[PDB]
Symmetry: C2
Subunit: 326 residues, 2 copies
Amino acid sequence: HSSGVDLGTENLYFQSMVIDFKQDILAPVATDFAAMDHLINEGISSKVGLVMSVSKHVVEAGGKRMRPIMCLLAARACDLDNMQNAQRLAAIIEMLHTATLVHDDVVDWNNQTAVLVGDFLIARAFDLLVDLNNMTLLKDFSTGTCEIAEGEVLQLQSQHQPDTTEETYLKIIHGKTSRLFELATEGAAILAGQEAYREPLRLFAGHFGNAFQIIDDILDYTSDAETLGKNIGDDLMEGKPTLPLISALAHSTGEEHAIIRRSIATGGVDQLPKVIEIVQKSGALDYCQRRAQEETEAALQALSILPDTPYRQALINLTRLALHRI
Amino acid sequence: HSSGVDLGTENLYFQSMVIDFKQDILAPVATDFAAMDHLINEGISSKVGLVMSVSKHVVEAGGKRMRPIMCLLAARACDLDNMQNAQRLAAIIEMLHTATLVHDDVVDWNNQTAVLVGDFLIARAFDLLVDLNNMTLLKDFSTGTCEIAEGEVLQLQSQHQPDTTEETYLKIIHGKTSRLFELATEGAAILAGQEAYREPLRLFAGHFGNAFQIIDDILDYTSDAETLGKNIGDDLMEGKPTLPLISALAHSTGEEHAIIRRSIATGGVDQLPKVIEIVQKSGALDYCQRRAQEETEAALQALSILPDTPYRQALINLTRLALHRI
Ligand SMILES: [Cl-]
Ligand SMILES: [Cl-]
Ligand SMILES: [Cl-]
Ligand SMILES: [Cl-]
Ligand SMILES: [Cl-]
Ligand SMILES: [Cl-]
């Protein structure tokens, strides 16, 4: 039932530009996904109108809800008997992602509404987790949420720090982006009691998540920044590390190096066009591109341990569709 | 070992103005409290400097840390064998309170730091909870945190609403203030396996918490508003319900009634001095005062079920010291 997974082999049959999200990724777990939605409405809305609206509005903003869909896919790939528990776990994953977005939307509705809605969602997610009655799952989630918060704080500490290393960037993005993908996929394996699939699914999702954040960062130094709901140079303004900037420093000397460095330290608008030009022409973006492809390769390799099912194929198709953004 | 608890009897021996917090409340659980502090530093700080500082600074701002002290007192009152678990529960209670404060400090360090520090504390608290390995406790906390968030949202929905009832106010304050006190005391009984003490300790803490929020509200319409780190009329500006204002409406007719009503709806500064005067002279503050004394009486009654120990005496002394603020 199991077999090797190769990016080059996928490309032989199936160009990534051909991959459709509804038919090639969602379709296997479609009914399950639709059943997840019914559970969420019960999960949040009837008591407080302000939350279901915001959580609806937030969900309305931006991307397809891949995180819960991945959870549902790993559960089927694990032959989970009680998929209702997968649907509940998918909802937890989604409420947690939504909480994080609403909380990242707070700036220095409104901030108080956003803070309170995020807290409410964290509370319901954790109450739903407790209802699943699995202490292994609870401990994974509790340690994991600490790692997510630690990642987010590490990023805040690394703001306007030109000396930030690639090691540190990978540490940050694993915390702030990758760990939630791991909870989604490995938590599915934990639910199914498929302990042999836990580490493969974790490694898959972590590498997936790593490539996902590298591409996001790349896109903020290109004309497709709007796709992320951002303007070009936004990350620069905030002084967040980002691999394009770290790599730009690695691919620059003399005055160009000094400009990028000062720009990170100060975060002034004056040299912003110059900095974007250096990042684009230094080769830094190509370096980030290669790193994202390498992570995508590591993701698919970890997946190849699982049996060849439509559910595995869907996860593979998602990884390639994500990579195709660049 | 057990006996009746009477406010009038306490007053026969012991005027509330005589009650000292260090000697009459903290002293029994002093060593335990000091041991809780060592655990918290391990609990948060070494990984991220930004959190231990804020959580130190936040703790530095404002009141004695009664919530963890109450937890420690209920645990001893329950004859808990493993007090190290009480100390861990006390830390959870404290990180949760601290999270709530830092989150309430966000306005429409800075907001992003406050949001992230609050989230980090919620994550560590929940990971410490999971480590206690008690599913009854976890479910109490998970349902309870939902009720806290629901209370906070209900308050946001009731902002600038003159029609808000006393029933609704009690609902709000039980959620936003009382429930955390219940988790502290009943969670201690849950740890000790003293199921017969759970409901008495819950009722005690809930009534305590109810009287605690009524007095806070009263104080914002008096010269002792600064004690809460507030200016007089602040609650009015934000449009939060508060029993003084609801009661002022109940104790007013004609134009004075209209002024208060419009003031709640609009939240303008122009009639603010007039509104404060009406609240002070209508008898509304006396009504709130009586309600707080009644809640204090209900708190002590629920406590009287427990054995007469120094730990029970300390909880009694705390309730009276809290009431003495007015
Ligand atoms: Cl998502
Ligand atoms: Cl199964
Ligand atoms: Cl590809
Ligand atoms: Cl406290
Ligand atoms: Cl015990
Ligand atoms: Cl008294």
